[PDB]
Description:
This is part of a larger assembly, with chains A (88 residues) and B (136 residues). Chain A is built from four helices and no strands. Chain A has helices at residues 6-14, 24-42, 49-72, 74-83. Chain A is globular, with a radius of gyration of 14 Å. Chain B folds into two domains: 1-78, Ribosomal Protein S8, Chain: A, domain 1 (2-Layer Sandwich), CATH 3.30.1370.30; 79-136, Dna Ligase, domain 1 (2-Layer Sandwich). Chain B has helices at 3-16, 28-40, 119-124, and strands at 21-22, 43-46, 49-51, 54-56, 59-61, 81-82, 107-112, 115-117, 131-135. The chains are: A mainly alpha (88), B alpha+beta (136). The chains hardly touch. Chain A: InterPro entries: Ribosomal_uS15 (IPR000589), Ribosomal_uS15_bac-type (IPR005290), uS15_NS1_RNA-bd_sf (IPR009068).
Amino acid sequence: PITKEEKQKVIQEFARFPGDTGSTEVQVALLTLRINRLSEHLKVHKKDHHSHRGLLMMVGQRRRLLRYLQREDPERYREIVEKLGLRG
Amino acid sequence: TDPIADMLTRIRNATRVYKESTDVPASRFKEEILRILAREGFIKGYERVDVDGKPYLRVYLKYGPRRQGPDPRPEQVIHHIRRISKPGRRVYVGVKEIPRVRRGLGIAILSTSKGVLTDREARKLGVGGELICEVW
RNA sequence: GGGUAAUGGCCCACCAAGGCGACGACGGGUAGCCGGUCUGAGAGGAUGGCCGGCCACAGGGGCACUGAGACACGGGCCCCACUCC
RNA sequence: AGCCGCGGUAAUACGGAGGGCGCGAGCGUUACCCGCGUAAAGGGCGUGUAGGCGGCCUGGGGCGUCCCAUGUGAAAGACCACGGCUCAACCGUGGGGGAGCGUGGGAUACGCUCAGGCUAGACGGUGGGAGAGGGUGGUGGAAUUCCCGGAGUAGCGGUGAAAUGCGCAGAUACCGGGAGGAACGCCGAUGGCGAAGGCAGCCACCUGGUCCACCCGUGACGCUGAGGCGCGAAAGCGUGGGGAGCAAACCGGAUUAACCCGGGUAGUCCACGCCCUAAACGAUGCGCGCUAGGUCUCUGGGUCUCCUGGGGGCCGAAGCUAAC
RNA sequence: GGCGCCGAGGGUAGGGCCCGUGACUGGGGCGAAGUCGUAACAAGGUAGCUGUACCGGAAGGUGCGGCUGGAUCACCUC
Lengths: 88, 136
């Protein structure tokens, strides 16, 4: 039911600078928020395969967002993966 | 994605439908290409145009006289336009291995070591390049 | 460490640790490889006993002396099958 | 020899003769070599990795590629000329050439590696739209089955026939009420959505994908895609379990001398797990980007002789003759 | 000369591969005229295509579900 206002926080949280609303860190951040929300859904609606597919879509997309920031600048990559609790 | 092939293709479909011109993505390597086909006669020429801030290379399709008898569709100039050396299948040749355009009537765009030249311009300067495409 | 072609293998001992490949082998089957020859112009496939060079095979298997090099060849020794005396 | 094919009273090798081609001896038989899918050739589909290929601008090192120089890979042999037997298969002599390898130098267009800048692919932000996407929790009606109460009752329920069934009763088509289960009309439409399947009474909630607009931001972080993972109508299989409709094996009449009709249990059903083919379709070798392109009907958004994104019908160019 | 090892036999036990043969099983192709029977019931419908379950010696049949086609003044359904 969420996802409407909390975005401002998530964005301004990973925003490298005032006005940034789509950086590699932001994209993964907001995208991850969706995965968590979707995950909390399947656990209730296991018989929901369609959305389950979209899950791998964002997860597969997210990982791609990571490997990129990794070969381009492994400095922010290590920070984003930590601020997201991803594989500590 | 192949920008050249996609370009030479537009040139084709442009003559089939019989158009006055056709816009193409502005590019340096492409400009030279269009420039050569203009010095020969394949095309009436080209021109740089910035559409909404986006640079292009609209070319003018040239056509020959009228057909032999009551029939519209003017006589085409570019009877063909395909590429040889392309992504994946890199095709290079030497000065002594230079291909043979359609019996002189045309040019084989070769990305030699001395700028985008033809089959002869390469043979003369004794330089080999990449089989960009054969036009005739 | 022993031995020798003189350290890249190999043989013995000790500790640790895996090495290689799918841009494809350890195994099965046939072919010896190449220059070269024919079909051919197409260069792809196939073949190679004669010609030249480079390798393996002494009925079979194994070890090793000989030995500057004639070094696992000839030949010699032992075993298995077999022929003659 | 290979194939079409011949003879049963005639064309020829069903036999032979006359005839003919090749031929320096010959000819013969046999064994070995020499792109494309709409209807043989679609993976069920989708998410992704290896891998390969990668819009725009400038610069540097510089591999691949190309060129020049030197040496070997020889000779043999092939090609060219000449000579000797001298007609040749031959042989002998000289020269040219070639790809490949190693070293050195130059070149830079494209590809490859790297750096600073652009984004006309996508993602994200804001503001909106459409659909049966999926799942869960409620709710409503018709119809079907059964009982009681009211009533009537000999015939009716069914095919062209008839049997079967109805026979405690008083049925079936009547009327009202009650219990249970399943499936869920008109609108549903050449429709729409979704990865496929599949899904369409309605409503609320959770949740996915997709489209459009202004056009800020991060920045091609891309595209396809083999293993792997999940998953398809009907179907069989295990456990728990209630009810209804239909129904193959089963039973009967008839026909015949059979699948139509009647009754109908096991079963089919729902949930979990296992399983998961031909599908659909032929728009599937996937699939992406660009490019050509008018009119009519229909769907969505912002605008309103429009444009972006679908479906159907009739074309033009071109492709495919062999579906015209 | 003696001792031991490196080697390689042989023997025993388990597993696997290749070749040849026998009681015997199932299925298929080809040669052609024949025996018998017959799915499309000889077509709006009927029917057919694909797959699975059940049944039969066989011809196959049949149910469910997803598509073709056909077609006129006539919808498909159990």
